[PDB]
Enzyme design. Sequence first.
Site, PDB file in Angstrom:
ATOM      1  N   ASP B 319      30.358  34.709  70.773  1.00  0.00           N
ATOM      2  CA  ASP B 319      29.587  33.683  70.076  1.00  0.00           C
ATOM      3  C   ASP B 319      28.134  33.866  70.495  1.00  0.00           C
ATOM      4  O   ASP B 319      27.857  34.369  71.584  1.00  0.00           O
ATOM      5  CB  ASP B 319      30.018  32.272  70.492  1.00  0.00           C
ATOM      6  CG  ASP B 319      31.459  31.968  70.152  1.00  0.00           C
ATOM      7  OD1 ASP B 319      31.896  32.300  69.031  1.00  0.00           O
ATOM      8  OD2 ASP B 319      32.146  31.378  71.011  1.00  0.00           O
ATOM      9  N   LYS B 320      27.211  33.455  69.631  1.00  0.00           N
ATOM     10  CA  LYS B 320      25.786  33.545  69.934  1.00  0.00           C
ATOM     11  C   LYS B 320      25.521  32.683  71.171  1.00  0.00           C
ATOM     12  O   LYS B 320      24.774  33.069  72.074  1.00  0.00           O
ATOM     13  CB  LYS B 320      24.974  33.019  68.746  1.00  0.00           C
ATOM     14  CG  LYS B 320      23.461  33.071  68.909  1.00  0.00           C
ATOM     15  CD  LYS B 320      22.940  34.495  68.867  1.00  0.00           C
ATOM     16  CE  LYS B 320      21.416  34.527  68.850  1.00  0.00           C
ATOM     17  NZ  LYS B 320      20.844  33.884  67.631  1.00  0.00           N
ATOM     18  N   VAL B 321      26.154  31.514  71.196  1.00  0.00           N
ATOM     19  CA  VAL B 321      26.020  30.568  72.296  1.00  0.00           C
ATOM     20  C   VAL B 321      27.403  30.141  72.771  1.00  0.00           C
ATOM     21  O   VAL B 321      28.258  29.775  71.963  1.00  0.00           O
ATOM     22  CB  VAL B 321      25.258  29.298  71.848  1.00  0.00           C
ATOM     23  CG1 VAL B 321      25.093  28.340  73.022  1.00  0.00           C
ATOM     24  CG2 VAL B 321      23.907  29.679  71.268  1.00  0.00           C
TER      25      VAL B 321
END
Lengths: 325, 324
Positions: B319-321
């Site tokens: 995930d990006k974050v």
Amino acid sequence: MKTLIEIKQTPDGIIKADKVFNKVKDKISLPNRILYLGCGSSHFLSKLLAMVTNMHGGLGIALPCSEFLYSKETYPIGEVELAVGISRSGETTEILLALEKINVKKLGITTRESSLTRMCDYSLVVPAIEESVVMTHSFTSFYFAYLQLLRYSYGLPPLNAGEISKATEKSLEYERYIREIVESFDFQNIIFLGSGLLYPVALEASLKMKEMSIFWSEAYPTFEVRHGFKAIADEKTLVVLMVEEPFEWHEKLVKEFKNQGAKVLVISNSPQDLGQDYSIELPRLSKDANPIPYLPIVQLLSYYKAVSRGLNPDNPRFLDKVVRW
Amino acid sequence: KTLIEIKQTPDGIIKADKVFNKVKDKISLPNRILYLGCGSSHFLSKLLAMVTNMHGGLGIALPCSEFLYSKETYPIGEVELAVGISRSGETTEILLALEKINVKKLGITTRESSLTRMCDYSLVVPAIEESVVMTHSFTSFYFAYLQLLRYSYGLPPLNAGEISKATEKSLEYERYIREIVESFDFQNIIFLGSGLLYPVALEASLKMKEMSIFWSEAYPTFEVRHGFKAIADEKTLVVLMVEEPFEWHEKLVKEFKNQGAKVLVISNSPQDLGQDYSIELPRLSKDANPIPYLPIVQLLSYYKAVSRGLNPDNPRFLDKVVRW
């Protein structure tokens, strides 16, 4: 073969360690600020000792020998009241070079009289003799001997060596279970997870797998693994989660790895089902001694994986029993 | 986007200098500083802690979750400033960690975020990235903070133009790096570095891991001889990063070649240590010297990923974050 025999000597190693502790307890006073130096597995033991020192109210810092030798300025060493040099052989060149540059009190931890003991003010010589190139029960024995000395020095009550030794006997009862995991799930890579005192155990476990089985093994602080590292875990991966008291996040993490296709082995002091494929429950001990029973488990896992690959854990390719320069 | 972002490193240095100058007289970094971050941001935290120690202060770095659940095992002690590092500024763990901190807080992120809202001051370095994998923001964050640290400690400022130009030199190695990937199909890789270059080795290994779903490892230069080297053979590329090599480095290179591995030496020295591949970078002030190394390892990871038919912008499972 000697590696397996040596892993199985862990219970006796605890007893030997207690004997050494009692012989030197009134001869060695451990201060507040302590620097721990070691290479390889001895570095991971140094990290564990530094952590437990902090846990008990002191200030412990651990550094790989060569980093202290060539890049000490980048580390938060500060004032050192005692330097502890850890070396199973007591002959590793880097530890000898590191200690000679130190002027404060020096304590050596090793299995025999050696170049190391000869340059230290005093030493904990724990005779957990090992012929295997890979360190096993000496790690656990060294830890217990020093832990007892630390507790004693800091005014805390002594740990029950018999109880801790018995706890490792319980770990050894999992030999068949571990062997069968290795025989059933042919994992191609593995990740060890642990937090706090179990993080250095995860690092050591990974090194055992690396040395014994010439294997793709990794280790991380439990939840740090979600930050990119988990990308390499799939249906060919075994994830080994070591946790004393799991909570909601652990269940989610186990499920996350299973969703990627990986199988999960949970080694814990809890009967809770987090969704793991394999489970190993160990006797819960005093917080500082609690990591001890985990060591023979990861050592056995690495040993059997090595044998399953036709490798000799006693003498891994390219490795020397003692690294010299 | 990953490649485009790596190539924005020169401009990132300039952006970083601008941010530094805007906040330098608003916050003075103290002696005792705690650095918190997750993943790549943890490795940056380690790097910042190291340079803090190098300049006479006392820096300690811990992964966010270790601070959250096992702080007692770490030598934190008294903290005069807590620095939270997060590219996104939205990572759940860093937010949970800082809400428990009552001491002064400084955030380092690329944008106004949940993080900046919970910090007293922030270094918002706009090295925006769309890729899941952090690249030039790592380098930009480092420079911005380094300038602030030097300034706070009474040291002269670094020349941003010179450092930015040094990273342009790193980028000139793009097609050489592509050639390494094309000519030696390595199956695993080991990054080595000491001091400030150790966290760079850790970051490099993570880039390779994320971008290429690859078996990559990283160790303090000489520690690798202690068992770890057992997994290096003819299918291994060893990347040694060193500012000023000495005798032991030549011996180490020879040791790996004897195991069949190929060696790439990235250094600020003209010395031949026996390496198979060589990348010489402009030598800078000791503290800023690691900067040109980052684009090199990011490019190596990018091209290895593409050679494997992978998309470095969005690695599988990531995930990006990271949120909870």
